[PDB]
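Researcher: Go.
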Amino acid sequence: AAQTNAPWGLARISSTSPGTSTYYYDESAGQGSCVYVIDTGIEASHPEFEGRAQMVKTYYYSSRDGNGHGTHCAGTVGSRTYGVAKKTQLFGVKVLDDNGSGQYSTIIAGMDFVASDKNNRNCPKGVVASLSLGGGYSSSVNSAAARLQSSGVMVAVAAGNNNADARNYSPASEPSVCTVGASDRYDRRSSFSNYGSVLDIFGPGTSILSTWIGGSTRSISGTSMATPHVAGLAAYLMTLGKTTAASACRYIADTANKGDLSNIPFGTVNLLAYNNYQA
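Model: Structure:
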């Protein structure tokens, strides 16, 4: 399948080179997989989601996205125009208020919710979780993400936007999950992107076009934007049978574009997510 005039990041994940604008992918498109977006919520009624998104949990007075951040990440996972995995199922878990902030205990509860809730959903091709969030180091936040991974869910988390070593942030520093940094359309490390030995992969993160609340669209930047590219790619690859939840992060790094990014500090992997699709 070929989507012309696609956002640059979708084209990049199916290209050996930068600078193209067509996204190529297998038409299975993540059908039969599920991705939990743990964030500020999802505007499920956005036409771009085609009925495939729904909220399943909130810790606040409403389950609606009054911020836009969670709607934008879910659009990069699975919207018809802006998503990697265009037939996957999206489940929203609102752990952040409409200002984009949330207590760690609420975030830990949301991770534990997903590890049980997936036994209530139909996901024959596997389960992914996308955590575009984080803060200072916390062993209890890391152990929550480690439990969610252990339960059979591919966990992808943002490295953080501090231009620093991600060892000092959580859940970025949990070694058992997939920690994602950000790159731009010229194959440069995004200027805000964290780095370090804990990072596993890079995805597109600067000037990313996606769904927004009010039925709109907009382009924003962050390692929160690169995380759903990798989350969506794992759901895509799990539907094709190429990998499993326990091993997708390893598979994605094994099959990535190697040595293509500039300004990667010594000791950080030089690996950009790639779907290896041959049309």
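Model: Residues 2-272 form a domain with the Rossmann fold fold (CATH 3.40.50.200).
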